[PDB]
RNA sequence: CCCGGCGAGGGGAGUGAAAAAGAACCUGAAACCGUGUACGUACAAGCAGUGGGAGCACGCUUAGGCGUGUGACUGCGUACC
RNA sequence: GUAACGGGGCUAAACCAUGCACCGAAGCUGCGGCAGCGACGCUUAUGCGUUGUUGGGUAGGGGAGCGUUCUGUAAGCCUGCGAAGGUGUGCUGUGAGGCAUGCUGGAGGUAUCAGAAGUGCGAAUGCUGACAUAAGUAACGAUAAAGCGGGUGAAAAGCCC
């Protein structure tokens, strides 16, 4: 639409707030090893479960 | 111990070692303030007198200070009719220090 | 030196009217003319 | 002991940047370090670089220890604009703004 | 003679946003609805002087009236009494020990009350 | 300003300026609304008010013991040096130099000294009179002045 | 300087039971409204609620004396439907019984949020089973 | 010398009187966005101001009921041109 | 949407006949400050003492003061022995304003008083700049779509192969 005025900027604020990135809640790592992880998915080792991905 | 005394037409509290405000008198710091209109010494109950101004009291000061406060502002004004006006004051007074009162 | 020690004559100084500065001055809007017509506007029309 | 690292003529709108700056206020070096770690976006290693930047010269140089380090302040200011045209109804040759940031973290033990 | 004109209006602004100081938003740091709050402010501020003693002189009637109706007699009739009986200058600011210390007071409203016919 | 007459214009009442013309003076910068004119401020100069006010200050010049009178001042050439080392002599420093003669080597000295001036009686500034510390003088200036006050 | 007057952290309120059961509803009701406000006491001050805490012991029988009873129907329009909306008065006493003298009470409080602040002291309950018993409730006659 | 792709940007080390002169460098507002502290925001409402004010930090309160800053709460109250 | 006492409440807390009281405005008045000016006294170039009606005010007239740019005393004199300029606060005046002071600053500054003027923006749906706003909102330009393997590379759904 437009609008009425120029808004205040604790409004700008209030309206990004729910929209904030939001916290990971720490950090996996193997039940098995001393490698880092990443959280239910594969590592550059193909350390999960073993085997092999992501050979780059 | 607490009084009552007439700054003037405006009546006012105080108590024995209480430094206590009132506009401005003549009398200065290296001299005696004293007020024969008291109105009730309290004492342990209300008193039921007629007369006031008691004969068998005083509340007994001195000047403390002699200065002026703070500036306050009056604006006066009138819209849409372009009426704007101002005036500035300061206001002189004189501190007193209560040593009298009898109980 | 004497000099920057003169003043005008008894009462010759009126400083007059600067007008259009502020409005809590008591001059400002108009000039001194009021509102609308040939007069309160700039310098035309009609003669004296 | 404190350093700063800029970045300057960085690829950002200021507004994405400000959403993460006042997350990690107060966050302290490890816990902000992750959280980056664990946001996947690419704004997110962004910041990382400039956010490694400030604990390696604590590392060395004037700083002694990492662990102790939290986070003082975070903050991003305007950096220089490029004009593009944007093409737009009835033949409307508005201006968009390509935005730039120049960022600043500044850590510190203190 | 080329006169620069404002470096005295920036005195005058930082006289009004510094009167503004505490006022919300905008008010603390635009002259424009800086100047306008200030204006208003002294008009309240100015008024409020007499207002608040009009106020208060309400609450006064009030502590006085609840000493009475305790002692059995209304206020207009407790006033209307001391007249009748002798002197007296009195003021309704004076009955702390109405709030406070409320067994005094006694003995002035029982005066009045017995003066009373 | 020159070089263009042209209209900035398209139209008034569109939520814009009036626009009318690229030289009005509003128009942000290039010249301005009331910019300076020549001014020229000199007068007539009334005959009578001038040489009365030259009466009273004229007057002032014995009552603060001012008027020297030095005996047909001059020296032998216009250099600067003769003349300071016979200003020094005599004790004056920072005067209203007041030639009775006109004469060219006294007229055309004193340069070096910073607060040091010379003039002469004919016709006498009114300005420099009122100001410096004392006037020199000689007795021709003297005599010329009360008769040009007569 | 000024004269010295009271401050929040000093109001005692203490508690009151209000037997109200040979009571009529408005006489009841403007002496109600008076102690919770703490108009009843020595308030001196504009903006502190004084007051007392008020149980009433019952109030699920009071009269209103005359007519007005059968007329007393509470008009509301919360956001539905054609016509005013009503509750009868036979709604009050046999549906959340308290509600009578609470929204007669209601109506003697000042603007919102004060009147909010003054309100939250009454309690009434259902009637004559009353729960502030270990608190030794100060009897009060009208 | 540290960080990063050979990058951009900043810091350290070292220069100068000064970098709170670091290369767009003169001292430098206000808008501008952000940090840190105090104290505030979940019985909670309108020109956000005025009056009354718990509470709380700092000021040997010279304790003599105050100063400073904030301020739960609430009586009253309609911007300027 | 009660909403014809303003409402709650009052079938007497109503209303009517008589009569008394209280509250209730810068009104009536007292304290303390003050403006201008009549009378009277001292007795003036300048005022102060007593007494007094007085002091809401636009348009508009008139009087007074300030600062900004500039001159003149200022060819003097103060200056890295910390100038202008910025800025937070205290003080002070009726107000404009002025003054003091920590911070900041690395060269400049000054009255009294008279005189000249490009002489204070917040409005002209005013002109220009820096830069805020609605916003993490809308956009993905004929959907001549794409895959997955490898590679330059630090990184690839779009590149190179």
Redesign the interface.
């Known amino acids: 639409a437009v609008q009425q005025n120029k808004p205040t900027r604790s409004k700008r604020g209030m309206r990004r707030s729910h929209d904030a990135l939001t916290a990971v809640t720490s950090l996996s790592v193997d039940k098995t090893s001393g490698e880092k992880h990443l959280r239910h998915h594969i590592t550059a080792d193909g350390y999960y479960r073993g085997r092999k991905v992501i050979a780059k | 111990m607490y009084a009552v005394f007439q700054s003037g037409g405006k009546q006012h509290r105080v108590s024995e070692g209480q430094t206590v405000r009132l506009e401005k008198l003549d009398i200065a710091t290296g001299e005696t303030v004293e007020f024969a209109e008291v109105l009730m010494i309290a004492n342990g109950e209300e008193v039921k007198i007629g007369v006031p101004f008691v004969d068998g009291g005083v509340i007994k000061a001195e000047v403390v200070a002699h200065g002026r406060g703070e500036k306050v502002k009056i604006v006066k004004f009138r819209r849409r009719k372009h009426y704007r006006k101002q005036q500035g004051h300061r206001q002189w007074f004189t501190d007193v220090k209560i040593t009298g009162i009898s109980a | 030196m004497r000099l920057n020690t003169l003043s005008p004559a008894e009462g010759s100084k009126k400083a007059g009217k600067r007008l259009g500065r502020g409005i809590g001055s008591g001059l400002g809007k108009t000039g001194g003319r009021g509102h609308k017509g040939q007069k309160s506007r700039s310098g035309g029309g009609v003669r004296r | 002991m404190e350093t700063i690292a800029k970045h300057r003529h960085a690829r950002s709108s200021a507004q994405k940047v400000r959403?993460?700056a006042?997350?990690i206020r107060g966050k302290k070096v490890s816990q902000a370090l992750?959280?980056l770690?664990?946001?996947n976006?690419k704004a997110?290693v962004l910041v990382k670089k400039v956010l490694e930047s400030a604990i390696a010269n604590a590392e060395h140089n004037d700083g002694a220890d990492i662990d102790d380090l939290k986070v003082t302040k975070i903050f991003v200011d305007e950096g220089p604009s490029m004009k593009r045209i944007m093409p737009r109804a009835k033949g409307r040759a508005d201006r968009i703004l390509k935005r730039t940031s120049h960022i600043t973290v500044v850590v510190s033990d203190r | 003679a080329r006169v620069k004109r404002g470096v005295i209006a920036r005195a005058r602004h930082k006289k009004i946003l510094k009167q503004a100081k505490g006022y919300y938003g905008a008010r603390s740091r635009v002259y424009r609805v800086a100047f306008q709050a200030v204006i208003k402010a002294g008009q309240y501020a100015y008024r409020d002087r007499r207002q608040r003693k009009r106020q208060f002189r309400q609450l006064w009637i009030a502590r006085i009236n609840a000493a009475a109706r305790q002692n059995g007699i209304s206020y207009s009739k407790f006033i209307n009494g001391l007249k009748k009986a002798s002197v007296e200058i009195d003021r309704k600011i004076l009955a702390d020990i109405a709030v406070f210390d409320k067994v005094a007071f006694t003995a002035l409203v029982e005066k009045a009350k017995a003066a009373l016919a | 300003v020159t070089g263009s007459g042209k209209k900035p214009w398209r139209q008034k009442g569109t939520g814009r300026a009036r626009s009318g013309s690229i030289k009005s003076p509003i128009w942000r910068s290039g010249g301005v609304t009331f910019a300076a004119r020549p001014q020229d401020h000199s007068q007539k100069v009334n005959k009578k008010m001038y040489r009365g006010a030259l009466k009273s200050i004229l007057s002032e010049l014995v009552r603060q013991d001012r008027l020297i009178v030095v005996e047909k001042f001059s020296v032998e050439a216009p250099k600067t040096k003769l003349l300071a080392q016979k200003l020094k002599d005599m004790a004056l420093e920072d005067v209203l130099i007041i030639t009775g003669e006109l004469d060219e080597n006294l007229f055309l000295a004193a340069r070096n000294l910073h607060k040091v001036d010379v003039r002469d009686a004919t016709g006498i500034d009114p300005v420099s009179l009122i100001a410096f510390d004392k006037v020199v003088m000689t007795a021709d200036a003297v005599k010329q002045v009360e008769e040009m006050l007569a | 300087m000024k004269t010295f007057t009271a401050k929040p952290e000093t109001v005692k309120r203490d508690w009151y039971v209000v037997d109200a059961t040979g009571k009529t509803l408005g006489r009841l009701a403007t002496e109600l409204a008076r102690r919770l406000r703490g108009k009843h006491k020595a308030e001196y001050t504009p903006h502190v609620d004084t007051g007392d805490y008020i149980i009433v012991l019952n109030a699920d029988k009071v009269a209103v004396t005359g007519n007005k009873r059968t007329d007393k129907v509470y008009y509301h329009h919360t956001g539905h439907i054609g016509g005013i909306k009503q509750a009868t008065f036979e709604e009050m006493i046999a549906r959340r019984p308290e509600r009578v003298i609470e929204i007669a009470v209601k109506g003697m409080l000042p603007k919102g949020p004060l009147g909010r602040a003054m309100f939250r002291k009454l309690k009434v309950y259902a009637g004559n089973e009353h729960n502030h018993a270990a608190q030794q409730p100060q009897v009060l006659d009208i």
Request: proline fraction near 0%; avoid cysteine.
């Open positions: 959403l993460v006042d997350l992750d959280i770690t664990y946001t976006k997110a």
